[PDB]
Short mmCIF file of N, CA and C and ligand atoms in Angstrom, two decimals:
data_model
loop_
_atom_site.label_atom_id
_atom_site.label_comp_id
_atom_site.label_asym_id
_atom_site.label_seq_id
_atom_site.Cartn_x
_atom_site.Cartn_y
_atom_site.Cartn_z
N UNK A 784 104.93 93.60 99.82
CA UNK A 784 103.95 93.00 98.93
C UNK A 784 104.12 93.51 97.50
N UNK A 785 104.24 92.59 96.56
CA UNK A 785 104.39 92.92 95.14
C UNK A 785 103.37 92.11 94.35
N UNK A 786 102.55 92.80 93.55
CA UNK A 786 101.55 92.11 92.75
C UNK A 786 102.20 91.20 91.72
N UNK A 787 103.26 91.67 91.07
CA UNK A 787 104.07 90.88 90.13
C UNK A 787 103.27 90.44 88.90
N UNK A 788 103.97 89.83 87.94
CA UNK A 788 103.31 89.32 86.74
C UNK A 788 102.32 88.22 87.10
N UNK A 789 102.69 87.34 88.02
CA UNK A 789 101.79 86.28 88.45
C UNK A 789 100.68 86.86 89.32
N UNK A 790 99.80 85.97 89.79
CA UNK A 790 98.67 86.30 90.66
C UNK A 790 97.70 87.27 90.00
N UNK A 791 97.80 87.48 88.69
CA UNK A 791 96.81 88.26 87.96
C UNK A 791 96.50 87.61 86.61
N UNK A 792 96.59 86.29 86.53
CA UNK A 792 96.45 85.63 85.24
C UNK A 792 95.01 85.64 84.73
N UNK A 793 94.02 85.61 85.63
CA UNK A 793 92.65 85.40 85.19
C UNK A 793 92.15 86.48 84.26
N UNK A 794 92.51 87.73 84.53
CA UNK A 794 92.05 88.85 83.71
C UNK A 794 92.71 88.86 82.33
N UNK A 795 93.80 88.12 82.15
CA UNK A 795 94.55 88.19 80.90
C UNK A 795 93.76 87.61 79.73
N UNK A 796 93.21 86.40 79.87
CA UNK A 796 92.51 85.84 78.72
C UNK A 796 91.22 86.59 78.40
N UNK A 797 90.69 87.38 79.33
CA UNK A 797 89.48 88.15 79.03
C UNK A 797 89.72 89.14 77.90
N UNK A 798 90.86 89.82 77.92
CA UNK A 798 91.22 90.68 76.80
C UNK A 798 91.45 89.85 75.54
N UNK A 799 92.20 88.75 75.68
CA UNK A 799 92.48 87.90 74.53
C UNK A 799 91.22 87.18 74.04
N UNK A 800 90.40 86.69 74.97
CA UNK A 800 89.21 85.96 74.57
C UNK A 800 88.22 86.82 73.80
N UNK A 801 88.07 88.08 74.22
CA UNK A 801 87.21 88.99 73.48
C UNK A 801 87.68 89.18 72.04
N UNK A 802 88.99 89.27 71.84
CA UNK A 802 89.53 89.35 70.49
C UNK A 802 89.20 88.09 69.71
N UNK A 803 89.39 86.92 70.33
CA UNK A 803 89.11 85.66 69.66
C UNK A 803 87.62 85.53 69.36
N UNK A 804 86.77 85.87 70.33
CA UNK A 804 85.33 85.75 70.13
C UNK A 804 84.81 86.86 69.22
N UNK A 805 85.40 88.05 69.30
CA UNK A 805 84.87 89.18 68.56
C UNK A 805 84.92 88.99 67.06
N UNK A 806 86.00 88.39 66.56
CA UNK A 806 86.13 88.17 65.12
C UNK A 806 85.09 87.19 64.60
N UNK A 807 84.52 86.36 65.48
CA UNK A 807 83.48 85.44 65.05
C UNK A 807 82.15 86.15 64.82
N UNK A 808 81.84 87.15 65.65
CA UNK A 808 80.55 87.83 65.54
C UNK A 808 80.50 88.81 64.37
N UNK A 809 81.63 89.41 64.00
CA UNK A 809 81.62 90.43 62.95
C UNK A 809 81.22 89.82 61.61
N UNK A 810 81.64 88.58 61.36
CA UNK A 810 81.24 87.91 60.12
C UNK A 810 79.73 87.76 60.03
N UNK A 811 79.09 87.40 61.15
CA UNK A 811 77.63 87.38 61.19
C UNK A 811 77.08 88.79 61.05
N UNK A 812 77.72 89.76 61.70
CA UNK A 812 77.27 91.15 61.61
C UNK A 812 77.36 91.66 60.18
N UNK A 813 78.47 91.37 59.49
CA UNK A 813 78.63 91.80 58.10
C UNK A 813 77.55 91.17 57.23
N UNK A 814 77.30 89.87 57.41
CA UNK A 814 76.24 89.20 56.68
C UNK A 814 74.86 89.69 57.08
N UNK A 815 74.72 90.28 58.26
CA UNK A 815 73.44 90.81 58.72
C UNK A 815 73.17 92.18 58.11
N UNK B 508 130.28 89.29 152.80
CA UNK B 508 129.57 89.39 151.53
C UNK B 508 129.43 90.85 151.12
N UNK B 509 129.43 91.08 149.81
CA UNK B 509 129.17 92.40 149.24
C UNK B 509 128.10 92.21 148.17
N UNK B 510 126.84 92.26 148.60
CA UNK B 510 125.72 92.06 147.69
C UNK B 510 125.39 93.37 146.99
N UNK B 511 125.04 93.29 145.72
CA UNK B 511 124.70 94.46 144.95
C UNK B 511 124.95 94.21 143.47
N UNK B 512 125.28 95.28 142.76
CA UNK B 512 125.55 95.22 141.32
C UNK B 512 127.05 95.04 141.12
N UNK B 513 127.51 93.80 141.29
CA UNK B 513 128.91 93.44 141.13
C UNK B 513 129.07 92.58 139.89
N UNK B 514 130.00 92.96 139.02
CA UNK B 514 130.22 92.27 137.76
C UNK B 514 131.36 91.27 137.92
N UNK B 515 131.09 90.00 137.63
CA UNK B 515 132.14 88.99 137.66
C UNK B 515 133.16 89.29 136.58
N UNK B 516 134.44 89.26 136.96
CA UNK B 516 135.52 89.56 136.04
C UNK B 516 136.61 88.52 136.23
N UNK B 517 137.76 88.76 135.60
CA UNK B 517 138.89 87.84 135.69
C UNK B 517 139.82 88.20 136.84
N UNK B 518 140.23 89.47 136.93
CA UNK B 518 141.12 89.89 138.00
C UNK B 518 140.46 89.77 139.36
N UNK B 519 139.19 90.17 139.47
CA UNK B 519 138.51 90.13 140.76
C UNK B 519 138.34 88.70 141.26
N UNK B 520 138.06 87.76 140.36
CA UNK B 520 137.84 86.37 140.76
C UNK B 520 139.11 85.67 141.19
N UNK B 521 140.24 86.38 141.30
CA UNK B 521 141.48 85.79 141.77
C UNK B 521 141.62 85.88 143.29
N UNK B 522 141.43 87.08 143.84
CA UNK B 522 141.63 87.28 145.27
C UNK B 522 140.37 87.03 146.10
N UNK B 523 139.19 87.04 145.48
CA UNK B 523 137.94 86.72 146.14
C UNK B 523 137.23 85.62 145.34
N UNK B 524 136.08 85.20 145.84
CA UNK B 524 135.26 84.20 145.17
C UNK B 524 133.86 84.77 144.93
N UNK B 525 133.19 84.21 143.93
CA UNK B 525 131.86 84.65 143.55
C UNK B 525 130.91 83.47 143.56
N UNK B 526 129.62 83.77 143.72
CA UNK B 526 128.58 82.75 143.68
C UNK B 526 128.14 82.54 142.24
N UNK B 527 127.09 81.75 142.04
CA UNK B 527 126.56 81.49 140.71
C UNK B 527 125.79 82.72 140.25
N UNK B 528 126.13 83.28 139.08
CA UNK B 528 125.42 84.48 138.61
C UNK B 528 123.95 84.20 138.35
N UNK B 529 123.12 85.22 138.55
CA UNK B 529 121.69 85.11 138.32
C UNK B 529 121.15 86.16 137.35
N UNK B 530 122.00 87.04 136.82
CA UNK B 530 121.58 88.08 135.88
C UNK B 530 122.69 88.29 134.86
N UNK B 531 122.30 88.44 133.60
CA UNK B 531 123.25 88.70 132.53
C UNK B 531 123.75 90.14 132.58
N UNK B 532 124.99 90.33 132.15
CA UNK B 532 125.57 91.66 132.03
C UNK B 532 126.63 91.64 130.94
N UNK B 533 126.66 92.69 130.13
CA UNK B 533 127.63 92.81 129.05
C UNK B 533 127.97 94.24 128.76
N UNK B 534 128.07 94.58 127.48
CA UNK B 534 128.36 95.93 127.02
C UNK B 534 127.45 96.24 125.85
N UNK B 535 126.82 97.42 125.87
CA UNK B 535 125.88 97.81 124.82
C UNK B 535 126.08 99.29 124.51
N UNK B 536 125.53 99.71 123.37
CA UNK B 536 125.69 101.07 122.88
C UNK B 536 124.31 101.66 122.61
N UNK B 537 124.07 102.88 123.10
CA UNK B 537 122.79 103.55 122.97
C UNK B 537 122.95 104.84 122.18
N UNK B 538 122.09 105.03 121.18
CA UNK B 538 122.06 106.24 120.37
C UNK B 538 120.61 106.67 120.21
N UNK B 539 120.39 107.98 120.18
CA UNK B 539 119.04 108.53 120.08
C UNK B 539 118.38 108.10 118.77
N UNK B 540 117.06 108.27 118.72
CA UNK B 540 116.29 107.89 117.55
C UNK B 540 116.67 108.74 116.35
N UNK B 541 116.55 108.15 115.16
CA UNK B 541 116.90 108.81 113.91
C UNK B 541 115.67 108.94 113.03
N UNK B 542 115.62 110.02 112.26
CA UNK B 542 114.48 110.28 111.39
C UNK B 542 114.45 109.27 110.24
N UNK B 543 113.28 108.67 110.02
CA UNK B 543 113.14 107.71 108.95
C UNK B 543 113.13 108.37 107.58
N UNK B 544 113.37 107.55 106.56
CA UNK B 544 113.42 108.03 105.19
C UNK B 544 112.71 107.04 104.28
N UNK B 545 112.10 107.56 103.22
CA UNK B 545 111.45 106.75 102.20
C UNK B 545 112.11 107.05 100.87
N UNK B 546 112.70 106.02 100.26
CA UNK B 546 113.28 106.17 98.94
C UNK B 546 112.17 106.45 97.92
N UNK B 547 112.48 107.21 96.86
CA UNK B 547 111.48 107.41 95.80
C UNK B 547 111.02 106.08 95.23
N UNK B 548 109.75 105.74 95.46
CA UNK B 548 109.25 104.43 95.09
C UNK B 548 109.24 104.26 93.58
N UNK B 549 109.84 103.17 93.11
CA UNK B 549 109.93 102.90 91.68
C UNK B 549 108.53 102.58 91.16
N UNK B 550 107.91 103.56 90.51
CA UNK B 550 106.53 103.44 90.02
C UNK B 550 105.58 103.08 91.16
N UNK B 551 105.86 103.62 92.35
CA UNK B 551 104.98 103.50 93.52
C UNK B 551 104.76 102.04 93.92
N UNK B 552 105.81 101.23 93.82
CA UNK B 552 105.78 99.82 94.20
C UNK B 552 104.61 99.08 93.56
N UNK B 553 104.64 98.88 92.24
CA UNK B 553 103.50 98.24 91.57
C UNK B 553 103.63 96.73 91.48
N UNK B 554 103.74 96.23 90.25
CA UNK B 554 103.77 94.80 89.96
C UNK B 554 105.00 94.45 89.12
N UNK B 555 106.17 94.94 89.57
CA UNK B 555 107.47 94.68 88.95
C UNK B 555 107.58 95.40 87.61
N UNK B 556 108.79 95.69 87.14
CA UNK B 556 108.93 96.33 85.81
C UNK B 556 108.34 95.50 84.68
N UNK B 557 108.05 94.22 84.91
CA UNK B 557 107.48 93.39 83.86
C UNK B 557 106.13 93.94 83.39
N UNK B 558 105.28 94.36 84.33
CA UNK B 558 103.94 94.82 83.97
C UNK B 558 104.00 96.10 83.14
N UNK B 559 104.97 96.98 83.41
CA UNK B 559 105.05 98.23 82.66
C UNK B 559 105.42 97.98 81.20
N UNK B 560 106.35 97.07 80.95
CA UNK B 560 106.59 96.64 79.57
C UNK B 560 105.41 95.82 79.07
N UNK B 561 104.72 95.12 79.97
CA UNK B 561 103.62 94.25 79.57
C UNK B 561 102.46 95.06 79.00
N UNK B 562 102.11 96.18 79.64
CA UNK B 562 100.95 96.95 79.19
C UNK B 562 101.17 97.52 77.79
N UNK B 563 102.41 97.91 77.47
CA UNK B 563 102.72 98.37 76.12
C UNK B 563 102.42 97.29 75.08
N UNK B 564 102.50 96.02 75.47
CA UNK B 564 102.38 94.93 74.50
C UNK B 564 100.96 94.81 73.98
N UNK B 565 100.00 94.49 74.86
CA UNK B 565 98.64 94.26 74.39
C UNK B 565 98.00 95.54 73.87
N UNK B 566 98.30 96.67 74.51
CA UNK B 566 97.68 97.93 74.11
C UNK B 566 98.03 98.28 72.68
N UNK B 567 99.30 98.09 72.29
CA UNK B 567 99.72 98.42 70.93
C UNK B 567 99.25 97.38 69.92
N UNK B 568 99.00 96.14 70.34
CA UNK B 568 98.51 95.13 69.42
C UNK B 568 96.99 95.04 69.38
N UNK B 569 96.29 95.75 70.26
CA UNK B 569 94.83 95.72 70.27
C UNK B 569 94.29 96.94 69.54
N UNK B 570 95.10 98.00 69.45
CA UNK B 570 94.70 99.16 68.66
C UNK B 570 94.69 98.82 67.18
N UNK B 571 95.65 97.99 66.74
CA UNK B 571 95.67 97.56 65.34
C UNK B 571 94.45 96.72 65.01
N UNK B 572 93.98 95.91 65.96
CA UNK B 572 92.78 95.10 65.73
C UNK B 572 91.58 96.00 65.47
N UNK B 573 91.43 97.07 66.25
CA UNK B 573 90.36 98.03 66.00
C UNK B 573 90.52 98.70 64.64
N UNK B 574 91.76 99.05 64.28
CA UNK B 574 92.00 99.68 62.99
C UNK B 574 91.61 98.75 61.85
N UNK B 575 91.86 97.45 62.01
CA UNK B 575 91.49 96.49 60.98
C UNK B 575 89.98 96.44 60.78
N UNK B 576 89.22 96.45 61.88
CA UNK B 576 87.76 96.42 61.77
C UNK B 576 87.16 97.80 61.56
N UNK B 577 87.96 98.86 61.65
CA UNK B 577 87.45 100.20 61.42
C UNK B 577 87.07 100.40 59.95
N UNK B 578 87.96 100.03 59.04
CA UNK B 578 87.72 100.28 57.62
C UNK B 578 86.62 99.39 57.05
N UNK B 579 86.52 98.15 57.53
CA UNK B 579 85.54 97.21 56.98
C UNK B 579 84.12 97.68 57.24
N UNK B 580 83.85 98.17 58.45
CA UNK B 580 82.52 98.63 58.85
C UNK B 580 81.45 97.57 58.61
N UNK B 601 91.59 106.12 61.00
CA UNK B 601 92.39 107.12 61.70
C UNK B 601 93.08 106.50 62.91
N UNK B 602 94.21 105.84 62.68
CA UNK B 602 94.94 105.20 63.77
C UNK B 602 95.49 106.24 64.73
N UNK B 603 95.90 107.40 64.20
CA UNK B 603 96.43 108.45 65.06
C UNK B 603 95.43 108.90 66.11
N UNK B 604 94.17 109.04 65.72
CA UNK B 604 93.11 109.34 66.68
C UNK B 604 92.63 108.11 67.42
N UNK B 605 93.06 106.92 67.01
CA UNK B 605 92.64 105.68 67.65
C UNK B 605 93.54 105.27 68.81
N UNK B 606 94.61 106.02 69.07
CA UNK B 606 95.46 105.75 70.22
C UNK B 606 95.19 106.71 71.37
N UNK B 607 94.60 107.88 71.10
CA UNK B 607 94.28 108.81 72.17
C UNK B 607 93.18 108.26 73.07
N UNK B 608 92.08 107.79 72.48
CA UNK B 608 90.95 107.31 73.27
C UNK B 608 91.25 105.96 73.92
N UNK B 609 91.84 105.04 73.16
CA UNK B 609 92.02 103.68 73.67
C UNK B 609 92.91 103.66 74.90
N UNK B 610 93.96 104.49 74.91
CA UNK B 610 94.91 104.46 76.02
C UNK B 610 94.40 105.28 77.20
N UNK B 611 93.97 106.52 76.94
CA UNK B 611 93.65 107.46 78.01
C UNK B 611 92.46 107.02 78.86
N UNK B 612 91.67 106.06 78.38
CA UNK B 612 90.56 105.55 79.19
C UNK B 612 91.06 104.89 80.46
N UNK B 613 92.28 104.36 80.45
CA UNK B 613 92.77 103.59 81.59
C UNK B 613 93.10 104.47 82.79
N UNK B 614 93.32 105.77 82.59
CA UNK B 614 93.80 106.65 83.65
C UNK B 614 92.75 107.72 83.92
N UNK B 615 91.75 107.38 84.74
CA UNK B 615 90.76 108.33 85.26
C UNK B 615 90.22 109.22 84.14
N UNK B 616 89.50 108.57 83.22
CA UNK B 616 89.10 109.19 81.96
C UNK B 616 88.47 110.57 82.16
N UNK B 617 89.17 111.60 81.71
CA UNK B 617 88.67 112.97 81.72
C UNK B 617 89.02 113.75 80.48
N UNK B 618 89.94 113.27 79.65
CA UNK B 618 90.46 114.00 78.50
C UNK B 618 89.40 114.07 77.41
N UNK B 619 89.51 115.01 76.46
CA UNK B 619 88.59 115.01 75.32
C UNK B 619 88.71 113.72 74.53
N UNK B 620 87.58 113.28 73.97
CA UNK B 620 87.48 111.98 73.33
C UNK B 620 86.96 112.15 71.91
N UNK B 621 87.10 111.08 71.13
CA UNK B 621 86.57 111.03 69.77
C UNK B 621 86.22 109.58 69.49
N UNK B 622 84.93 109.26 69.51
CA UNK B 622 84.53 107.86 69.44
C UNK B 622 83.95 107.52 68.08
N UNK B 623 84.32 106.39 67.50
CA UNK B 623 83.78 106.00 66.19
C UNK B 623 82.35 105.51 66.30
N UNK B 624 81.72 105.38 65.13
CA UNK B 624 80.35 104.90 65.03
C UNK B 624 80.26 103.45 64.58
N UNK B 625 81.38 102.73 64.57
CA UNK B 625 81.37 101.33 64.15
C UNK B 625 80.79 100.44 65.23
N UNK B 626 79.77 99.66 64.86
CA UNK B 626 79.09 98.81 65.83
C UNK B 626 80.03 97.74 66.38
N UNK B 627 80.82 97.11 65.50
CA UNK B 627 81.67 96.01 65.94
C UNK B 627 82.71 96.47 66.96
N UNK B 628 83.32 97.63 66.73
CA UNK B 628 84.28 98.16 67.69
C UNK B 628 83.60 98.75 68.92
N UNK B 629 82.35 99.19 68.78
CA UNK B 629 81.64 99.80 69.90
C UNK B 629 81.48 98.81 71.05
N UNK B 630 81.14 97.56 70.74
CA UNK B 630 81.08 96.53 71.77
C UNK B 630 82.47 96.21 72.29
N UNK B 631 83.47 96.21 71.40
CA UNK B 631 84.81 95.79 71.77
C UNK B 631 85.42 96.70 72.83
N UNK B 632 85.31 98.01 72.64
CA UNK B 632 85.97 98.94 73.56
C UNK B 632 85.39 98.83 74.96
N UNK B 633 84.10 98.52 75.07
CA UNK B 633 83.49 98.38 76.39
C UNK B 633 84.16 97.26 77.19
N UNK B 634 84.43 96.13 76.54
CA UNK B 634 85.18 95.07 77.21
C UNK B 634 86.56 95.56 77.60
N UNK B 635 87.21 96.30 76.70
CA UNK B 635 88.48 96.93 77.04
C UNK B 635 88.30 97.95 78.16
N UNK B 636 87.20 98.71 78.12
CA UNK B 636 86.96 99.72 79.14
C UNK B 636 86.84 99.09 80.52
N UNK B 637 86.15 97.95 80.62
CA UNK B 637 85.98 97.29 81.90
C UNK B 637 87.31 96.89 82.53
N UNK B 638 88.36 96.71 81.71
CA UNK B 638 89.67 96.39 82.25
C UNK B 638 90.21 97.52 83.11
N UNK B 639 89.96 98.77 82.71
CA UNK B 639 90.44 99.91 83.49
C UNK B 639 89.81 99.95 84.87
N UNK B 640 88.56 99.49 84.99
CA UNK B 640 87.91 99.44 86.30
C UNK B 640 88.66 98.50 87.23
N UNK B 641 89.02 97.32 86.73
CA UNK B 641 89.76 96.36 87.54
C UNK B 641 91.22 96.76 87.71
N UNK B 642 91.76 97.54 86.78
CA UNK B 642 93.16 97.96 86.89
C UNK B 642 93.38 98.81 88.13
N UNK B 643 92.41 99.67 88.46
CA UNK B 643 92.57 100.56 89.61
C UNK B 643 92.75 99.79 90.90
N UNK B 644 92.12 98.61 91.01
CA UNK B 644 92.28 97.79 92.21
C UNK B 644 93.75 97.45 92.44
N UNK B 645 94.50 97.22 91.36
CA UNK B 645 95.93 96.97 91.50
C UNK B 645 96.66 98.20 92.02
N UNK B 646 96.27 99.38 91.55
CA UNK B 646 96.92 100.62 91.95
C UNK B 646 96.24 101.32 93.12
N UNK B 647 95.15 100.77 93.63
CA UNK B 647 94.54 101.25 94.86
C UNK B 647 94.71 100.19 95.94
N UNK B 648 94.16 100.47 97.12
CA UNK B 648 94.19 99.55 98.26
C UNK B 648 95.62 99.25 98.70
N UNK B 649 96.40 98.61 97.83
CA UNK B 649 97.75 98.22 98.19
C UNK B 649 98.65 99.43 98.44
N UNK B 650 98.55 100.45 97.59
CA UNK B 650 99.50 101.56 97.64
C UNK B 650 99.37 102.41 98.90
N UNK B 651 98.29 102.26 99.66
CA UNK B 651 98.06 103.13 100.81
C UNK B 651 99.14 102.94 101.87
N UNK B 652 99.38 101.70 102.28
CA UNK B 652 100.28 101.46 103.41
C UNK B 652 101.74 101.65 103.02
N UNK B 653 102.14 101.15 101.85
CA UNK B 653 103.55 101.09 101.47
C UNK B 653 103.99 102.39 100.79
N UNK B 654 103.92 103.48 101.55
CA UNK B 654 104.44 104.76 101.08
C UNK B 654 105.21 105.54 102.14
N UNK B 655 105.13 105.17 103.41
CA UNK B 655 105.77 105.91 104.49
C UNK B 655 107.25 105.54 104.58
N UNK B 656 108.01 106.31 105.37
CA UNK B 656 109.43 106.05 105.54
C UNK B 656 109.68 104.65 106.07
N UNK B 657 110.70 103.99 105.52
CA UNK B 657 111.01 102.61 105.87
C UNK B 657 112.52 102.44 105.93
N UNK B 658 112.96 101.18 105.99
CA UNK B 658 114.37 100.78 106.02
C UNK B 658 115.01 101.09 107.37
N UNK B 659 114.28 101.78 108.24
CA UNK B 659 114.66 102.04 109.63
C UNK B 659 115.91 102.91 109.74
N1 LIG C 901 128.83 97.34 139.04
C1 LIG C 901 129.69 96.58 138.14
C2 LIG C 901 130.03 97.41 136.90
C3 LIG C 901 130.94 98.60 137.16
C4 LIG C 901 130.17 99.82 137.63
O1 LIG C 901 128.95 99.72 137.83
O2 LIG C 901 130.80 100.89 137.79
C5 LIG C 901 130.97 96.13 138.85
O3 LIG C 901 131.07 96.19 140.07
O4 LIG C 901 131.94 95.71 138.21
#
């Protein structure tokens, strides 16, 4: 059994999505 | 008749006759059991060498993101905490007071919780001597 690059895709965009979403909130935070 | 453990052959079947065989017979070799061996597992049989190069990728590009939002409100001190959290966090730490990054690292921190599942459970069975 090998976990491999595949079969773990779901967790990948969570790191990326937080980066994408995070930059949106800081602009509101700076204005706040 | 000579009933018993008689092996049909070529020379014997010349001067006498045989009936229809009812049991197989051949030639085999027997050797005692041998001690098993386990090769040094390459990174303990993880998720291929791709993942090891893979982790270097996002980790090094996500530390820069924190550095960018750090000044807006120390990269050398920003790699000790960000990385070491993934491996059973016990080392001394130094955490910033930036609100924007404070939420960010927690999402990153939660990744380490799920990472252990990859390196636990599976690794238990596949460590004993193999290859026979
Ligand atoms: N019993 C077989 C094999 C030989 C042996 O058992 O010695 C035969 O008669 O040919």
